[PDB]
Amino acid sequence: KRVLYVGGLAEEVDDKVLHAAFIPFGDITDIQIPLDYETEKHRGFAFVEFELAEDAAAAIDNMNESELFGRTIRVNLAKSNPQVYMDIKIGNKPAGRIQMLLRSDVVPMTAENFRCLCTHEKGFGFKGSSFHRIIPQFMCQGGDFTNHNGTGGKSIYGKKFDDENFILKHTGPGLLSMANTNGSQFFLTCDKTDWLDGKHVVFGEVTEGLDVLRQIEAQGPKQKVIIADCGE
């Protein structure tokens, strides 16, 4: 809930202008502006990531429909426990953003691994990888960024790490759980999957974009499902 979409940007607006306009609400960790290399100009929008979700929230309230460089801008969510996002592309088509809360309070090692794999801060991660196993009414599995078939992946700690605990249960759809010997592979549940309780470590939940998860499930893969971008 830390990443914001910012649209309606005049040509003169750039990453410096955005930093200056949004920093009053709190520290910012990243600013991305898609470019058209044929023109060398941006496409009128950007994504601003705040350090704190509370600050991102205050920014949405005060900046949405505000004026920047003479015109009205649009600001909204793009898609203590870390929150991360994945932007999903299905076939050649953007599907939207899934936002996830990681339960560092319950499973700190498991949450930290997934967090780092979203940011790529350890030198590798999920960006550009696929959901290679998708079963309707069950789950969508990804994170195999080395072999892309369920045989690969690696954690930030080495090839594998221990099951921390089984406190969190598979109680319904939209939960994050480790595939397994934990590495980087994970799944997003599409129903209650309680037969996996005590076998797979649950470590997070979808907070925004359940609809995007349902679009992934709809491919259960009939079309490639790619993590086009991700981060914290």
């Binding site: 929230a57 309230d61 949405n64 429909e65 649009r74």
Partner: peptide
Amino acid sequence: REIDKAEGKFWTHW
């Protein structure tokens, strides 16, 4: 295109 499309009306309760 847009009317009454507010900006953080309440205090982010989920």
